[PDB]
Copies of this chain bind each other. A is one copy, B any other.
Amino acid sequence: MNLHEYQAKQLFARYGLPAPVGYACTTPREAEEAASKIGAGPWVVKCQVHAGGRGKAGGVKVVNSKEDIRAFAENWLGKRLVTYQTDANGQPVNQILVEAATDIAKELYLGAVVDRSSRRVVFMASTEGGVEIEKVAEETPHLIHKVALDPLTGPMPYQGRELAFKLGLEGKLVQQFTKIFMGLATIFLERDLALIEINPLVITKQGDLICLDGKLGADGNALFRQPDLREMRDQSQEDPREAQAAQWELNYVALDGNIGCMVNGAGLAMGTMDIVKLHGGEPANFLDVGGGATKERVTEAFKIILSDDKVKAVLVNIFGGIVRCDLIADGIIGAVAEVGVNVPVVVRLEGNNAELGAKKLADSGLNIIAAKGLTDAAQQVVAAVEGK
């Protein structure tokens, strides 16, 4: 899960890492009152949304009057910010971070992720701060420096110095950088982070390192042992259907398309979306029916899939699982009536009682086709949305 920038900065502060003095505000009044708490302006005001590109989208501004802070806050609070990292609907702005302006001398990049190829937490630093790091990676590889945390020893100061020297830092900046590295590496391990990104990690005109932005991603699988991080989750930042699905043991991800997919298995779910796409269809969502295809769970799945008005048909592809095909068919039938599914549903069943389940669908009289095989199921749901 993602954290807000203000939350990443509180975490940084807890670990002695440096960030601008600032306040996360939920009302224009708090935002304007932050001005004097911070000190002499100007002040940076930032919409807090998980997505990046807030700057290009107008969500980050340097202002110099309490009046401007308040206006910015009035302008954004309760409103949604669209960036190239959100969908066209954007993320709600419920917090405005008001912080001290920083005198930037140089912009660096420091970040870490779990690298799956080397199977290590890898820190990456670059003099290319303020740019999307991926771009820099494509064009100027030689400018990205990396170190892998050794699981046996934990992060070591020499790794911090290695990156610092490769960035051409010298003097106290080397110790400062090392400190930031050791702290960030420590946070990464202790808080079970999946991602850290300080972009830009700034060298101030006064000559100090400061984290100007902060993007942290926690490993969702470790939340059971990260109580503080658990509380920081902000559901408003995501499609509410995801959490709904999750609480129902369903993995849901909305897409552009109009053919809803209900499948058991993540890989099969993606493969099913792909086969629908291959046959001229446009998948509306990814929905992995992770739990046992019970009547209730399948009903939820439909409620969730059909909460998106663009869906004109639902393809259900169940292969095995704990429930028998005939009981899954009763679940689909039941879900279709109860949810008042108003769209054609195409079903592909495999396993115990596949044909009895298919017969059950055929005999319900509901608008539900029991397909014969995957390709067939794909073609049929595709056909089913022709001209709708």
Chain A positions within 8 Å of B, measured between CB atoms, are 151-152
Copy total for this chain: 2
CA distance A151 to B151 in the complex (A): 10
**Distance in Å from the Cβ of A246 to the closest Cβ of chain B?**
29
Sample of 2 A–B contacts (CB below 8 Å): A151-B152, A152-B152
CA distance A357 to B268 in the complex (A): 88
CA distance A362 to B151 in the complex (A): 62
Measured between beta carbons, the chain B residues less than 8 angstroms from A152 are: 151-152
Interface majority SS (helix, strand, loop, mixed), chain A: loop
In the complex formed, the residue of B with least CB distance to A150 is B152
**Distance in Å from the Cβ of A295 to the closest Cβ of chain B?**
40
CA distance A306 to B149 in the complex (A): 54
CA distance A151 to B150 in the complex (A): 12
In the complex formed, the residue of B with least CB distance to A151 is B152
**Distance in Å from the Cβ of A20 to the closest Cβ of chain B?**
32
CA distance A295 to B152 in the complex (A): 46
**Distance in Å from the Cβ of A150 to the closest Cβ of chain B?**
10
**Distance in Å from the Cβ of A252 to the closest Cβ of chain B?**
35
**Distance in Å from the Cβ of A189 to the closest Cβ of chain B?**
11
In the complex formed, the residue of B with least CB distance to A152 is B152
**Distance in Å from the Cβ of A154 to the closest Cβ of chain B?**
10
In the complex formed, the residue of B with least CB distance to A153 is B151
CA distance A108 to B151 in the complex (A): 35
CA distance A152 to B151 in the complex (A): 7
Measured between beta carbons, the chain B residues less than 8 angstroms from A151 are: 152
